[PDB]
Symmetry: D2
Subunit: 128 residues, 4 copies
């Protein structure tokens, strides 16, 4: 991956991992997300994500977003961040997410959306 391609494997401050396949000339990509965390009474399932990374001004440190479609859940998480190359040539994904729960009724909407951050750095795509 070119410095800051989202392509490859990544881990975050929560221990969550994600895999992002090749990014086409449209900035689009899909991948999978394995969350290390849930408030779920359900088996965590590696879940597909789908996104785009920015390709306006073809910036070395592009911003991006993607949706993760939980397999084990009725919710969705969207993440948006920027890929930064730090002082040591190390790629850092700085992200924020909205985690959308499925609420019963439009009147429960006010409580459906959680927010937070994640910081992702690169994992070896090659195992021992």
């Amino acid at each position: 991956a070119r410095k800051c391609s989202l392509t490859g494997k990544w881990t975050n401050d929560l221990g969550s991992n994600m895999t992002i396949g090749a990014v086409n000339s449209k900035g689009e990509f899909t991948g999978t997300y394995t969350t290390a965390v849930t408030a779920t009474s359900n088996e965590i399932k590696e879940s597909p994500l789908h996104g785009t990374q920015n390709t306006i001004n073809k910036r070395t440190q592009p911003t991006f977003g993607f949706t993760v479609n939980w397999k084990f859940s009725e919710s969705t998480t969207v993440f948006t961040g920027q890929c930064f190359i730090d002082r040591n040539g190390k790629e850092v994904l700085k992200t924020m997410w909205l985690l959308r729960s499925s609420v019963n009724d439009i009147g429960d909407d006010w409580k459906a959306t959680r927010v937070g951050i994640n910081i992702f750095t690169r994992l070896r795509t090659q195992k021992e």
Copy 2:
């Protein structure tokens, strides 16, 4: 569109419009977004989005997220909401977004992410 398919045209409280093409059996879709608003010294450009709508428990009022990849900008917006069918059979998208700006340096990250909501309802896909 089946009650609550995200497929079709939609408008939001900002006057922004979006078009969402067919949703495959994976919950995936692409579309375009025309924002009625920017803080941009640049021509607003109808911009592509890409997402997934939830299809766990095949719920009549599914949650969803998608990324919009601004053509006129270095930023990304991700939206996540739920499709609700209101008391009158009317589809309401209740959404929250994170709008990610491109900041110069990882140290500017703290200020890169704006948040807000949008409410979307359906526009006629057939013009006069």
Copy 3:
């Protein structure tokens, strides 16, 4: 209340009401908040809030924030918005909130914070 003083009674899109007493020359105020909504297995209790409204450039449409300290809950909500005087001289509070739940352990922190908006307009402080 001078056009846009937060002082007085207000209601929001959720049916929630709040009372804000006089704002001192520091921009500070306290008040009470009665939420029309909870996900709580507990009696909703009118709860105290405490805040400040902005008083830099003494702007007619000042921004502000305050904390509500739920009496019936271990959580806190903070709201921040701006007071706008609309096209018809009508005061509109546009706000966003972070609702902080109390989670058991620092490792549960990622899921503790909900976000959303509220829109508040003025209620008669004088009853029939």
Copy 4:
């Protein structure tokens, strides 16, 4: 400060410092905040904050919120977090904030609110 009183001095991942005076039996406190960061063409000014920490169930790891009223700015920041005592007896404030800018018109509201996190740990209140 009792393990998890917000009272004392704190620093955050941004280098920002804050001082929080005694917390009364109402959970209320005031203090000052010196941000290490701005997007401001203005002298950063140590700015007052005002808040409450939770005191329902008198939990060792209480949640809390407070408003900072920027002296050098038309904006407000509200923070809400939880005070956690980590595996080593060390107090960690985990927080999220909404930083509210002052926008010109109610129609600019959608872009006024930034969000992010801060992590605060304790500084010596006693200098060398």
